[PDB]
Amino acid sequence: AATREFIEMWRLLGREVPEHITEEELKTLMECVSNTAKKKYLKYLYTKEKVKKARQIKKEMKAAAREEAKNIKKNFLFLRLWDRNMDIAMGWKGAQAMQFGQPLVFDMAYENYMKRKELQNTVSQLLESEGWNRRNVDPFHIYFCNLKIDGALHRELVKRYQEKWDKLLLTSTEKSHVDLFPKDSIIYLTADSPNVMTTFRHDKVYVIGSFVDKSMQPGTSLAKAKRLNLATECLPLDKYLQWEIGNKNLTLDQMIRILLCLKNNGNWQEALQFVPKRKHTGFL
Amino acid sequence: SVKGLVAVITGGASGLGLATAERLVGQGASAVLLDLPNSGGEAQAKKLGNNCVFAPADVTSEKDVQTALALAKGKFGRVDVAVNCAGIAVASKTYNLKKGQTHTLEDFQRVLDVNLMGTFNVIRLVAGEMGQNEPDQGGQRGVIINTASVAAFEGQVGQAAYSASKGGIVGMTLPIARDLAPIGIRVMTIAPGLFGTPLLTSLPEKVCNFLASQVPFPSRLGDPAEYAHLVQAIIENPFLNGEVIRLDGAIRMQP
Amino acid sequence: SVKGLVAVITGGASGLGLATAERLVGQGASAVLLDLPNSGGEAQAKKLGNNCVFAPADVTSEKDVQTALALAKGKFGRVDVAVNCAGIAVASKTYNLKKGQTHTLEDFQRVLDVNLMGTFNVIRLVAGEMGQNEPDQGGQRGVIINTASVAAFEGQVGQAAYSASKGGIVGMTLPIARDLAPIGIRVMTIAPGLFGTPLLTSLPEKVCNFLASQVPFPSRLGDPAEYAHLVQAIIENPFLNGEVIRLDGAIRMQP
Amino acid sequence: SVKGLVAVITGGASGLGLATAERLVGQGASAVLLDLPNSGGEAQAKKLGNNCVFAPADVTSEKDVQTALALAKGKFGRVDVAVNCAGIAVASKTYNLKKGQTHTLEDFQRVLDVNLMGTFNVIRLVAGEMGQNEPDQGGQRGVIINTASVAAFEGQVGQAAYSASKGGIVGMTLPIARDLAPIGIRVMTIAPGLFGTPLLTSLPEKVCNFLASQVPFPSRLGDPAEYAHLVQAIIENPFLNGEVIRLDGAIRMQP
RNA sequence: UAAAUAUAGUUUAACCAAAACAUCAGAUUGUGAAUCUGACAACAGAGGCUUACGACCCCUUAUUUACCG
Ligand SMILES: Nc1nc2c(ncn2[C@@H]2O[C@H](COP(=O)(O)OP(=O)(O)OP(=O)(O)O)[C@@H](O)[C@H]2O)c(=O)[nH]1
Ligand SMILES: Nc1ncnc2c1ncn2[C@@H]1O[C@H](CSCC[C@H](N)C(=O)O)[C@@H](O)[C@H]1O
DSSP: OTTHHHHHHHHHHTSOOOSOOOHHHHHHHHHOOSHHHHHHHHHHHHHHHHHHHHHHHHHHHHHHHHHHHHHHOOOOSSOSOHHHHHHHHHHHHHHHHHHHSOEEEEEOTTGGGOOHHHHHHHHHHHHHHHHHHHHSSSOOEEEEETOOSSSHHHHHHHHHHGGGGGGOSSEEOSSOHHHHSOTTTEEEEOTTOSSBOOSOOTTSEEEEEOOOOSSOOTTHHHHHHHHTTOEEEBOOHHHHEEEOSSOSOOOHHHHHHHHHHHHTTOOHHHHGGGSOGGGEEEEO | OOTTOEEEEETTTSHHHHHHHHHHHHHTOEEEEEEOTTSTHHHHHHHTOTTEEEEEOOTTOHHHHHHHHHHHHHHHSOOOEEEEOOOOOOOBOSEETTTTEEOOHHHHHHHIIIIIIHHHHHHHHHHHHHTTSOOOTTSOOEEEEEEOOGGGTSOOTTBHHHHHHHHHHHHHHHHHHHHHTTTTEEEEEEEEOSBOOHHHHTSOHHHHHHHHHHSSSSOSOBOHHHHHHHHHHHHHOTTOOSOEEEESSSOOOOO | OOTTOEEEEETTTSHHHHHHHHHHHHTTOEEEEEEOGGGOHHHHHHHTOTTEEEEEOOTTOHHHHHHHHHHHHHHHSOOOEEEEOOOOOOOOOSEETTTTEEOOHHHHHHHIIIIIIHHHHHHHHHHHHHTTSOOOTTOOOEEEEEEOOGGGTSOOTTOHHHHHHHHHHHHHHHHHHHHSTTTTEEEEEEEEOSBOOTTTTTSOHHHHHHHHHHSSSSOSOBOHHHHHHHHHHHHHOTTOOSOEEEESSSOOOOO | OOTTOEEEEETTTSHHHHHHHHHHHHTTOEEEEEEOGGGOHHHHHHHTOTTEEEEEOOTTOHHHHHHHHHHHHHHHSOOOEEEEOOOOOOOOOSEETTTTEEOOHHHHHHHHIIIIIHHHHHHHHHHHHHTTSOOOTTSOOEEEEEEOOTHHHHOOTTOHHHHHHHHHHHHHHHHHHHHSTTTTEEEEEEEEOSBSSSHHHHSOHHHHHHHHHHSSSSOSOBOHHHHHHHHHHHHHOTTOOSOEEEESSSOOOOO
16 A cells, blocks of 8 residues: 555654554554544554553563562462352353343444444443443343444454353344333433433333444434434433533443442432542532 | 350360350350360460360360360369361362372371361260260250351362361261260251351452352351351250251352 | 341241240240131230231232231231241052052142142242331341241151142242342241141150150150241341251151 | 273272172273272182273272272273272261260271272372373263262261261262363262172171161162162263262161 | 533543553462453544644534623
8 A cells, every 4th residue: 555655754754653553554544534633543553552562561570570579589268269250150140130130221323423433432331331230249131232243333342352252141132122122111311311310210221322422422312212212311410410521421331330339229429429520529 | 045054165266166155155154165275275265254264185186185075074064065166178179180280188188187087086075975964854965066068068169178078077967966866965067158267257358258249148258156146046956956057148159 | 136026927826836926926026927717826816915916818829918918017017027837738648559549639739739839929928028128237138937847858658749848848948048139038948857736746646656756866746846946046147048957856757 | 882981990899899890891891990909809800801900909098099090001091980989887886875885086087088088089099090081072081980878868876987988978079070070070979778788798687688678669688780780871971970879779767 | 602621441640741540351370360461542523733742723512600881
């Protein structure tokens, strides 16, 4: 590719540019069809190396630090096998959740509204969100609805989980949540809903739209809910928090941690602990 | 009731044995802590007052136990209850193919010496001491309580030696109860699950929370005081004989 | 302790159930006698004072148990303990070749309906009432104690129907204990042996005295009071859950 | 099928071990009689053809078993099945009040060593030899069959030592099955009761002929060939693992 | 309408420049796994400029405050 015609002086020009690039990275560079977009991507691609080597340099510096102390310097009940035992324990709990647990739906029908940066970030929040469900005392039955098998979102999920994808204790499906559940019990959670969520209802299916629009697109989740006949609710952030800073649309890992706290009889004081403290000045 | 009874509690300087002694002495009974000399038994016996004394002895030695039983007769005049809480735990895989490591036989023998062999050594000797007692209104001469573990039913990976020793205690509880039935001595066994003994509490807080969460209900490690409560219930109830009671909060240990 | 606790004892007009109510009420608790209308529980409830009330209900019917628990809620305001002592028995061989007699399916179904179905019916409805209670300092909402004799393990000749029902109670003790673990309800099972219930005192002295002598120690039929003592011990011990306790004096039933 | 398999039969010079070797060799397998030098196993090995060899070794001795296992490696190349059948017994009671007799400690130690420690000694050493085998189509490297007794559940009077060792085998059969699960080795336990072995001929004939009538059905002594048939069944079934199989003709041992 | 702001796991720090705590996959861990090997690292967004940068300038959405001779 001739796209090297930009990089090979942009390094000499004085802008921050990474030294190691591949054709796969080079391909995504040419979709950036403006000077600022290319500069923004190159800045991201440059800082990837910057924290890599800095953390790289840290780790073998530690290797010398421990190898000198490790080489120079009884009755037990259990073998030290806890990480294996914890994973098995969460597996049994997840298997029980898939049968009797309350369903929670992550709507994957937002692939067409996301750029590559946003789509990748959605998976990262999805990975953390499902991780917190596993470690909970009373896990949800997590559903991935509207997830196209060949779609971009599915391929990214497979790449991140690798072998674990086929072994996850969650129900991923092509069908919409309206096909799996009665339309009366579905409550599409969205920040733009005019109805404020008062109490957590254990006989309802809460739908979270897996949409991370860093280029914020208000009303997208509400439009989907009103395109169907689904009811909507919004978190009582204004009721219990003194907001000052930032968007009121929380991340997927914060949302699931708020719902999990509510499901475990926690009040709104404990549940809203997971709203970033940088966005408000205390609970009232 | 347990007031006026004399209890010999092997391994009574710590853990379940110490909790049993504290409750029985508090309820009005007298206790003899039979533990190793290196343990803090002397301090514990002093803390419990004049109704509790410390008899240093190794349960694996016949001579040591007989001297301890003589001490109980000297101080209190008779033996009414024997509680066998002394025991050690060893975690070791039977064979590890990747590491080429085979379970050491001496590891198996020492666990069997203290848990299984030590328990029976106390039982055969303390039974003769209760055989000198005049039967009460019910015709009973004494109560013998052994401490097995849940590993006797679902042992985990690396508990081959521990489960075998504890499984043997479950094995002997009925035949010994049959042996001592003419005499009038009851034999019972308690199988505690995960308990807040110094063995478990010394573990990192990360794994302590996990072990507590594994118990269905209550989701916490067993209080040693709860073991003491069940020991008293067996003593007071005349119709409990030759039975293993699991005190584990319905936990079934995973591999 | 059990003071202030509200206990619903099924089959409390006679036998093990009545003995449990006398001990619990005598210890300061309140008891709701749930039994058949013709069982004479009203006379027993009057004898036990104002802390004991009789609720006539058939455990095999969901309607009667719901009204009985509504009466327990009305009189005392809450339910804390459920003791399933209601039970019947049938002595009939599965098949007699010398007589050409086959076990009647109505007899097998009748025993299961009261012993097995009635126990679960009480459990499933009572768990709704303990679910309304606020968890205590230990997080416990209630205790359920089931009765399932040693016939569940070593049944005798002609006890197939009775062992099937009691084997069912033993088998389902753990799954129900795991079911109610999130709620905070402990499910425990007692396996009484030969007890001096009005059933055993009815049969002639020949089999009565012989069976009493077949118990290793004590060589007598179990006092129903001793059953009540172990029932109270389970209530007071927070760590007893999902376990079957044999209360038989170490007797193993021969064919 | 068992054709071509190499089996190390512990205590295979008489009783259950000899019957197991007799059946497996007849079916086309190879056997190694691991028994004491004075047991007369050399005659048994010769009678069974060139497919059977005698390895004189004491199960309590680590050196003896390693040489015996190395002999099987030299003669046959691999070890596929291990059957632990060697065991001794003692008829001493725990304590006799009338005679002032106490179960001597050495009798309990000697029975425990051969039965419990000896079984584990063979298990851990044969696990290394089985770990060298290539996993078959089902991923299995070998099968280890242990011989407990019915006394592990309902041991009689004067069987405290025997029940302890047999209870230990039942106790550790699951942890060892869990320990060896990644390797691909199945551990199963058989609990025979009253078999026509030399053990059931040392006892007085009138007593022995009476026990044959105690078995519900078949009302006789167990044929050692029936034990050999069950061992072959366990070998050929890939899903039998970690379980204790009672083979007693539905007998429950009275006190 | 105007000014302040806007960290997509969370905080801190900021012309320091990357941390600390977390997250995902693999691990049969001999009790420092208190680790190792990998995965992901975008300071609202889209554009302009500038040798450059997080700076500077329009624009979009949003948040908090104020808002008529
Ligand atoms: N002073 C003042 N003016 C306000 C306030 N809110 C709205 N306005 C005025 O209302 C205007 C609304 O702008 P727009 O939202 O573009 O107006 P619109 O008529 O809704 O047009 P579209 O956005 O195209 O739908 C603002 O630009 C101000 O002139 C307020 O709080 N204070
Ligand atoms: N304050 C809030 N109350 C309820 N749900 C919220 C919320 N904030 C975020 N969510 C949920 O979290 C998900 C990602 S936030 C993104 C929402 C979407 N881009 C929009 O503009 O409307 C959404 O599906 C939304 O349902």
